[PDB]
Amino acid sequence: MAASCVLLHTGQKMPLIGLGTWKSEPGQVKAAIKYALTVGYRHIDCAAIYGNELEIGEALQETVGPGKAVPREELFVTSKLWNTKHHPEDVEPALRKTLADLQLEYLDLYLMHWPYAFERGDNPFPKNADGTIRYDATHYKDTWKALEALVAKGLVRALGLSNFSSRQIDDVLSVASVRPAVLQVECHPYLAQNELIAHCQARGLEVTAYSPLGSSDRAWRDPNEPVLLEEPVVQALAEKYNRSPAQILLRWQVQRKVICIPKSVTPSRILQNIQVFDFTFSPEEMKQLDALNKNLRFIVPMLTVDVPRDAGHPLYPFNDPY
Numbered sequence: 001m002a003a004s005c006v007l008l009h010t011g012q013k014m015p016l017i018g019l020g021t022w023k024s025e026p027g028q029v030k031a032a033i034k035y036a037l038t039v040g041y042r043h044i045d046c047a048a049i050y051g052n053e054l055e056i057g058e059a060l061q062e063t064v065g066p067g068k069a070v071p072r073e074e075l076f077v078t079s080k081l082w083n084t085k086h087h088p089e090d091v092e093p094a095l096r097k098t099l100a101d102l103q104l105e106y107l108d109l110y111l112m113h114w115p116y117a118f119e120r121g122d123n124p125f126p127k128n129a130d131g132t133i134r135y136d137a138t139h140y141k142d143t144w145k146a147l148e149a150l151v152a153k154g155l156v157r158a159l160g161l162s163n164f165s166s167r168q169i170d171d172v173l174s175v176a177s178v179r180p181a182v183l184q185v186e187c188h189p190y191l192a193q194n195e196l197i198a199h200c201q202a203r204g205l206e207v208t209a210y211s212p213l214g215s216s217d218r219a220w221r222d223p224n225e226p227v228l229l230e231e232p233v234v235q236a237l238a239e240k241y242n243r244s245p246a247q248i249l250l251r252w253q254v255q256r257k258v259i260c261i262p263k264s265v266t267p268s269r270i271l272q273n274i275q276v277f278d279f280t281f282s283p284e285e286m287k288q289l290d291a292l293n294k295n296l297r298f299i300v301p302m303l304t305v306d307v308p309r310d311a312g313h314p315l316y317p318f319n320d321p322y
């Protein structure tokens with residue numbers, strides 16, 4: 001309880017800062033979880049596809065539960081269902097594998113990672129022939145019903161959506177017996193998602209900003225695109241407040257009640273990342289940061305440098321205006 005929370009429609013308190021775990025590798029992730037929990041983190045964001053749940057599970061078993069440093073009821077754990085696991089028959093075995101890897105009895109939030117499905121099987125990136133992705137045409141509404149059955153089994157407290165557009169979200173609500181509780185999408189001053197955030201508050205979904213720091217060490221990247229953390233306005237607010245640029249980026253979000261999940265393995269950065277509730281931007285400063293909006297998306301799935309992997313798919317979420 002270093003961080004403040006938001007109330008989900010379920011009644012669960014969701015901390016406004018969580019630890020991101022994308023690219024924290026086995027061999028380092030265990031130390032990150034442990035450091036983050038011990039300095040006050042009560043919110044971990046995970047996914048099967050990140051390939052580190054087995055070692056995250058090792059750290060959680062040591063530190064969380066009856067007899068341990070952290071009670072289980074005070075930890076918010078999120079995971080996500082991968083694209084190969086959209087068929088109703090596969091949703092439950094996928095989740096139980098994640099539960100086993102994590103050594104958990106339940107998840108607090110389970111998200112649908114993408115609205116489109118991949119070919120069923122044990123290959124996370126199944127391919128053709130030409131090396132393009134092999135797709136499966138399971139509709140996200142069918143996946144959603146199968147996810148609801150997990151809530152009934154006590155395996156998950158809340159459900160939600162990742163990389164869904166406003167129309168996909170409303171499509172899900174038209175059939176939802178258990179309403180999604182959270183949308184997780186890319187958000188920061190260059191891609192402010194003001195429209196989609198307003199749409200979510202209308203519908204009772206809370207919003208989690210992924211890549212809240214511009215994800216500065218993503219695996220390829222254009223030479224010529226700006227770096228969010230180097231942004232002049234951000235660097236000058238940093239100096240004004242005696243804070244780091246990352247703290248500026250995160251304060252902007254929690255100030256509008258957007259949940260953030262910054263990833264770090266650096267103990268000093270982990271510490272500072274959750275220390276965003278002791279200062280406040282003036283309306284005019286907020287405005288400066290609201291002026292940076294440029295529709296710059298950093299996280300787009302790519303493959304085979306011999307391209308944008310899914311951009312051409314009919315269910316690709318990023319083609320609508322929001």
Ligand SMILES: NC(=O)c1ccc[n+]([C@@H]2O[C@H](COP(=O)([O-])OP(=O)(O)OC[C@H]3O[C@@H](n4cnc5c(N)ncnc54)[C@H](OP(=O)(O)O)[C@@H]3O)[C@@H](O)[C@H]2O)c1
Binds near residue numbers: 212
């Ligand atoms: N739903 C989805 O499809 C999806 C997609 C993308 C991301 N996510 C989630 O959101 C999380 C966060 O996003 P992200 O990992 O893409 O990137 P991010 O959190 O925006 O950026 C992390 C990068 O910034 C560095 N960093 C951390 N704190 C810093 C600080 N205080 N000052 C300067 N640099 C700092 C990290 O380095 P060090 O670690 O070395 O310290 C790392 O290179 C992910 O880990 C994942 O859990 C989900």
Ligand SMILES: O=C(O)c1cc(Cl)cc(Cl)c1O
Binds near residue numbers: 301
């Ligand atoms: O969105 C992600 O975090 C992500 C992570 C990994 Cl490791 C692979 C793909 Cl396609 C992703 O989309």
